[PDB]
Design a protein around this ligand. Structure first.
Ligand SMILES: [Zn+2]
Lengths: 180, 112, 138, 46, 49, 88, 49, 85
RNA sequence: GAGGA
DNA sequence: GATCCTCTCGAACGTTCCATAGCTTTTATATACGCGCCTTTTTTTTTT
DNA sequence: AAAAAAAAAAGGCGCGTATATAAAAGCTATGGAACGTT
């Protein structure tokens, strides 16, 4: 065991607590994107940290695309200021971790069919559909996306250890349903 | 009790009446037969008794009994007119209950 | 979900795609539903079977099928990209056997018959030719 | 050899545990015979 | 020596007994008994083949 | 797409296996008695079976002159069915 | 018969074709699958048995 | 808990009698048991009247994939006092 | 189905 | 009705329109592995 | 003979498959209403 499921992404929503002018942000801001016919969301991205700001008409701004919690936070604080840089009285309010997407590798194929027959209470392999396996640990509430290549993808989390602590309790089962 | 759409009541009433009817007699003339999930109609009570192996003629006026046997017969001119040659294996099976008296107690002891 | 449950329990091999060709399920909500249903039934309480079905669908004889059987049996122990959704591995084992033989069922017919990739077969065949060492019974 | 089953069609030999129930491995048949015993059965010449 | 002529259902050989029936499309005339009011009848049970 | 073959398949099979000529839902209203089990007791019994003949339900039990040469004047299962069952 | 597996088979040991035959029995393959033997019968009242 | 009171000694582990074995009475010929879900006996003794030799035992799978078995018993019948001719 | 008588 | 025995089988309807929750909206990502489809690659082709 | 053009596809990523979160903004459908309609 002892494999850290590296967070492949971290999501975070921050509310500006205001109401911008969506056309105004499109014309004035530089790293901004917003299309009415598709979805009324401002597509704002900053090069450092490289995340995306899912800014809606109601000031709900989502920070996605970082790999760590604070990068998804640091980008947000930059995100709010650049909105303030437009000329609005935006405010960095209501920051929260939304989701932590993460994957790992075990370097050995796993008997997911073995995982499914004994741990079918917990396993789900769809070789015809999904080359991984969905192993949802209740405590912590983490889903282990368990691939035949060994890719154990973990997400549905806002706690960094929750991804980590769940794996430490699941590797022996993969060694149970391993080949070599 | 739960509201009376006044003429679904008859639609269910006649149903109940029909059910009881065919239950006591599945052979009402000018009727459907209450079938049972198989095509075979239901064996109402009345048909449980109808003649020729109803209860009466089949289980009361005549039944099937123990202590009996059945076989092919064969003539024999060395049997007294009233005798009958029951084959040994049969006699090994049919029995007759004697009562132990001083007259037979020894013999019965030998038998047992 | 329950149909695949019944087939697996009675040892019947059935493709999600076959089941979906029976029923419009969108296959993704189907995946989630089968997952949850399997978990429910596990609370309430082996991939070789697919070979002969496709052997029949392609019209293949029984010795060919048993050659494929032994190939698939060794497939589990021949990681080195063994299975990763082993339906592809089964179909490539079939392709190995037909190429070992002289059967005019060239990849086009088998692919269009089994709704499989014309390229994943050769992707498997790449490692299959190296793997050829551990596949000769007689 | 000692025997456990016979393929019906191929008329060869075979052995099996509680495994498969079919497949004269050569012909892959589905009917097998129970490979007559060796109890040296006794018989009465009459 | 087996001569065929039968079906195998569930592995049990079944055989269809020929059924006899009256001929269709044939006109027939019958007297009727005294109690009836009709003294004669001509009947024809026409049917498509 | 979505044609219930099992309808025809099972319908034919069931009808043969029981001989109730009718529908699988028809229990008694279906005519029965066809499709017996091919008496194979003795070769000749088999042959005779395959050429048998039935009549449901006018003196039909009689032996009419027109049977000459078409139906065996002799063979018939005396009993209730005497005269009804015939053989070619 | 020894290959069929059906209920209730009865096979004679030493069948014999009849001595008195009819032409037609040829077509019934009877004299190849006979169904009895030729006993030396004697018609007599021997011992009333 | 449902032993047939006959004689199970004949058959082998697969609940079958090898052909050529002599049987009689109501010796079981098929040992089939059912789970209670320990497990009760649902064997198949042969007819209490008769006896003979197991002739040939055929094992196969049903149409649907159920393993299923046919057994044939051989017996010689000599004419007796009552037989019909 | 079977069916003997 | 229609003998006798074995033995085999399966005010209701419209009508309007608020009120529930969803869904679906993009967008981060691990894998395989599907078509998708660009483009240049690569030929085949036509004319000079 | 030689130039130039006409056109198939190969291979690569299309995105797309599923898998899993996490976010409410056009649309859907469910859920609620009782009063217009005979
Ligand atoms: Zn064989």
């Amino acid at each position: 065991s002892g494999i850290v499921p590296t967070l492949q992404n971290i999501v975070a929503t921050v509310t500006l607590g205001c109401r911008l002018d969506l056309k105004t942000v499109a014309l004035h801001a530089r790293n901004a994107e917003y299309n009415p016919k598709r979805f009324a969301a401002v597509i704002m991205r900053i090069r450092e940290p490289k995340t995306t700001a899912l800014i809606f008409a109601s000031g709900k701004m989502v920070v996605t695309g970082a790999k760590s919690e604070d990068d998804s936070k640091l980008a947000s604080r930059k995100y709010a200021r650049i909105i303030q840089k437009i000329g609005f009285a935006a405010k960095f309010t209501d920051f929260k971790i939304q989701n932590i997407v993460g994957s790992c590798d075990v370097k050995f194929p796993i008997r997911l069919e073995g995982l499914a027959f004994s741990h079918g209470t917990f396993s789900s392999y769809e070789p015809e559909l999904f080359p991984g396996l969905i192993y949802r640990m209740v405590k912590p509430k983490i889903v282990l996306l368990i691939f035949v290549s060994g890719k154990i993808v973990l997400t549905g989390a806002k706690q960094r250890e929750e991804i980590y602590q769940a794996f430490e309790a699941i590797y022996p089962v993969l060694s149970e349903f391993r080949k070599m | 009790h739960n509201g009376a759409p006044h003429h679904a009541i008859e639609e269910a009433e006649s149903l109940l009446q029909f059910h009881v009817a065919t239950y006591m007699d599945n052979d009402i003339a000018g009727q459907p037969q209450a079938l049972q999930k198989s095509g075979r109609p239901v064996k109402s009570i009345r048909a449980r008794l109808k003649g020729k192996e109803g209860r009466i003629r089949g289980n009361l006026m005549g039944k099937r009994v123990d202590f009996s046997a059945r076989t092919v017969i064969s003539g024999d001119p060395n049997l007294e007119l009233d005798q009958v040659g029951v084959p040994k294996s049969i006699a090994k099976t049919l029995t007759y209950p004697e009562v132990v008296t001083p007259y037979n107690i020894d013999r019965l002891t030998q038998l047992v | 979900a329950s149909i695949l449950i019944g087939c697996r329990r009675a040892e019947v091999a059935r493709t999600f795609k076959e089941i979906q060709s029976l029923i419009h399920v969108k296959t993704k909500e189907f995946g989630k539903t089968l997952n949850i249903m399997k978990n429910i039934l596990r609370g309430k309480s082996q991939n070789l079977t697919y070979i002969p079905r496709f052997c029949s669908h392609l019209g293949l004889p029984m010795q060919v099928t048993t050659s494929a059987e032994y190939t698939a049996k060794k497939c589990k122990e021949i990681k080195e990209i063994a299975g990763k959704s082993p339906i592809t591995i089964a179909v490539v084992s079939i392709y190995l056997n037909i190429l070992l033989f002289q059967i005019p069922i060239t990849a086009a017919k088998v692919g269009q018959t089994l709704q499989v990739t014309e390229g994943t077969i050769k992707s498997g065949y790449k490692i299959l030719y190296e793997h050829r060492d551990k596949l000769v019974d007689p | 050899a000692t025997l456990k089953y016979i393929c019906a069609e191929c008329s060869s030999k075979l052995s099996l545990s509680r495994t498969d129930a079919v497949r004269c491995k050569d012909c892959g048949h589905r009917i097998l015979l129970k490979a007559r015993t060796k109890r040296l059965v006794q018989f009465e010449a009459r | 020596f087996d001569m065929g002529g039968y079906f195998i259902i569930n592995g049990s050989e079944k055989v269809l007994i020929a059924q006899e029936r009256s001929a269709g499309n044939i006109v027939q005339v019958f007297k009727k008994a005294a109690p009836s009011p009709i003294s004669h009848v001509a009947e024809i049970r026409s049917a498509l083949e | 797409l979505a044609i219930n073959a099992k309808t025809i398949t099972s319908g034919l099979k069931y009808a043969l296996a029981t001989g109730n000529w009718g529908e699988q839902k028809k229990a008694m209203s279906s005519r029965a008695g066809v499709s017996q089990v091919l008496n194979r007791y003795t070769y000749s019994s088999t042959l005779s079976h395959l050429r048998r003949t039935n009549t449901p339900i006018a003196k039909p039990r009689q032996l009419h002159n027109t049977h000459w040469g078409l139906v065996c004047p002799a063979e018939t299962p005396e009993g209730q069915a005497c005269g009804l069952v015939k053989n070619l | 018969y020894n290959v069929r597996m059906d209920t209730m088979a009865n096979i004679l040991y030493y069948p014999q074709k009849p001595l008195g035959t009819t032409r037609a029995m040829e077509y019934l393959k009877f004299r190849e699958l006979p169904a009895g033997q030729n006993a030396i019968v004697a018609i007599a009242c021997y011992s009333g048995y | 808990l449902r032993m047939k009171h006959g004689t199970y000694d004949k058959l082998d582990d697969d609940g079958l009698i090898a052909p050529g074995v002599r049987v009689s009475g109501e010796d079981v010929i098929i040992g089939k048991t059912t789970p209670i879900s320990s497990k009760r006996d649902a064997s198949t003794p042969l007819r209490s009247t008769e006896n003979g030799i197991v002739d040939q035992v055929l094992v196969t799978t049903n149409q649907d994939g159920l393993k299923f078995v046919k057994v044939r018993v051989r017996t010689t019948k000599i004419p007796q006092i009552g037989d019909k001719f």
